[PDB]
């Protein structure tokens, strides 16, 4: 009747548990996977709690489902921000890599080095993990499919649930069955290095520029404002807005390279019966419906860009206008971390034509833009 307390007190068993579960390695994000590099130093002991409240559940709504869960406890790693005596120590190799990345001359080199480092070391680290064994079964039948998944316990007895349940008490087969706390790797660094790294990792540089009223459109209930003057070379704007004070220009921080999704996408004229832009990349989004005739070959449409889906979050509409033909939404951030700019993006409720793009409904995250960097 051994528990996590029995394996944690034994150096051999504790190290076997640590190694077989990749507890010293970060997570790289086909899906999340552990990194081959060890991120933190091997601890002398682990903080753990015991939990043996096993469960067997089944359901036959033919979507039959089954779940045999057998927990053993929870293991918790302690982060620098907690301030406790025990703190996970970053591997000297990782710290040296960070310092080497930050030592390069230009910001582009510093960002590329950090990208390589975080690709080979992972983006996040699991600080709270639940240990044990879970056996799940699914059988959707109308044609017919069956799916058995085993995570922990003797996996060679997946076909025989009795023997798997019997084996669930062998400590050599305990695995991580759930993660309840994840901390960004950058958050494990000292404060100045943490700030520098988190600023460098931001995909976009930002800049405020005064605005000008779009000529015409007197029928609308609110004025339309666009960046005044010529856009600085290499910078891009995000769409029409109702803000009368400022507009946000953005610039990519990383050069385009094969295999990486650019932060911004070019926009192309619509196929037929519509003057709105369409995103060149599949799942990218822009924030404002274009007012006027879009054209990707001449300004200001030549410098309008759409954002990567991870840069934006859904917003909320505030409606203006006494009728549908006059109605327009203004997009405001869903007031809540991960806050979004109050750009006040304008979105016409009913565009004159047919076959128009889907109505934009998003606002840009404030954490994706770097300001006043001198870049």
């Amino acid at each position: 009747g051994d528990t996590l307390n029995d394996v944690i007190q034994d150096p051999t068993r504790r190290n076997k548990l640590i190694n077989d579960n990749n507890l010293l390695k970060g997570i790289i994000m086909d899906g999340p996977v552990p990194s081959s590099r060890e991120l933190i130093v091997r601890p002398d002991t682990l903080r753990a709690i015991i939990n043996n409240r096993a469960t067997i559940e089944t359901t036959t709504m033919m979507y039959t489902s089954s779940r045999c869960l057998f927990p053993q406890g929870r293991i918790d790693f302690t982060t620098p921000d907690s301030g406790f005596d025990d703190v996970i120590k970053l591997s000297p190799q990782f710290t040296s890599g960070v310092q080497a990345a930050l030592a390069k001359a230009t910001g582009t080199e510093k960002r590329e080095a950090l990208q390589n480092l975080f690709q080979e070391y992972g983006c996040v680290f699991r600080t709270k993990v639940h240990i044990g064994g879970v056996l799940s079964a699914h059988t959707m039948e109308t044609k017919l499919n069956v799916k058995y998944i085993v995570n922990g316990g003797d996996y060679t007895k997946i076909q025989n649930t009795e023997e798997w349940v019997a084996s669930t008490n062998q400590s050599e087969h305990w695995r991580v069955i759930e993660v309840t706390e994840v901390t960004a790797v950058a958050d494990l660094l000292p404060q100045p290095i943490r700030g520098q790294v988190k600023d460098l990792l931001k995909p976009l540089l930002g800049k405020w520029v005064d605005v000008e009223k779009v000529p015409g459109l007197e029928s609308l209930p609110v004025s339309v404002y666009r960046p005044k003057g010529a856009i600085p070379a290499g910078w891009f704007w995000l769409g029409d807005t109702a803000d009368a004070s400022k507009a946000l220009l953005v610039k990519p921080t990383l050069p385009a390279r094969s295999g990486r999704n650019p932060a911004l996408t070019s926009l192309h004229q619509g196929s037929g019966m519509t003057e709105q832009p369409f995103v060149d990349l599949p799942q990218y989004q822009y924030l404002s419906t274009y007012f006027g005739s879009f054209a990707h070959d001449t300004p200001p449409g030549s410098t309008l860009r759409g954002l990567r889906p991870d840069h934006v979050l859904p917003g909320r509409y505030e409606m203006h206008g006494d009728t549908i033909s006059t109605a327009v939404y203004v997009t405001r951030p869903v007031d809540v971390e991960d806050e979004c700019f109050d750009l006040k993006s304008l979105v016409r409720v009913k565009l004159p034509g047919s076959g128009n793009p889907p109505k934009p409904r998003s606002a840009l995250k404030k954490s994706m833009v770097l300001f006043d960097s001198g870049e």
Partner: protein, 135 residues
């Protein structure tokens, strides 16, 4: 006769779906797009939801030589706000009246409903386009 007819287009422009209910069609018949001989059942529309920017077309007409015209009613409801009524639509083109009647009744201030294209002076009821927006 087939001469008395109506085309009703539910054109959703809001951010939420709207559901059609109680499609009765007390007089005349429903028919497929551009073909009055291809009779269709009200079940093809009853309980269906119109998603944003989606067009739904309902075509009604009098029978070939029944001298009846075509009359019918339906309701727009909010699929999320407890199936509450949005508006009640009643269309009527009698054969002998020589004066049609299209009416939208009920009240739900949470929805903006506009309609255009109807003709009432004489003849067919014309093509009616209805724009619905949920605010």
């Amino acid at each position: 006769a087939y001469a008395q007819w109506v085309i009703i287009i539910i054109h959703n422009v809001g951010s939420q779906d709207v559901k059609i209910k109680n499609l009765k069609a007390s007089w005349g018949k429903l028919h497929a797009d551009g073909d009055k001989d291809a009779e269709v059942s009200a079940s093809n529309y009853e309980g269906k939801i119109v998603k944003p920017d989606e067009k739904l077309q309902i075509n009604a007409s009098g029978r070939s030589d029944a001298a009846e015209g075509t009359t019918g009613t339906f309701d727009l409801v909010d699929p999320a706000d407890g199936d509450k009524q949005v508006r009640h639509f009643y269309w009527d083109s009698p054969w002998g009246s020589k004066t049609n009647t299209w009416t939208v009744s009920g009240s739900n201030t949470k929805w903006m409903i506009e309609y255009s294209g109807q003709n009432l002076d004489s003849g067919a009821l014309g093509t009616i386009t209805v724009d619905t927006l949920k605010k």
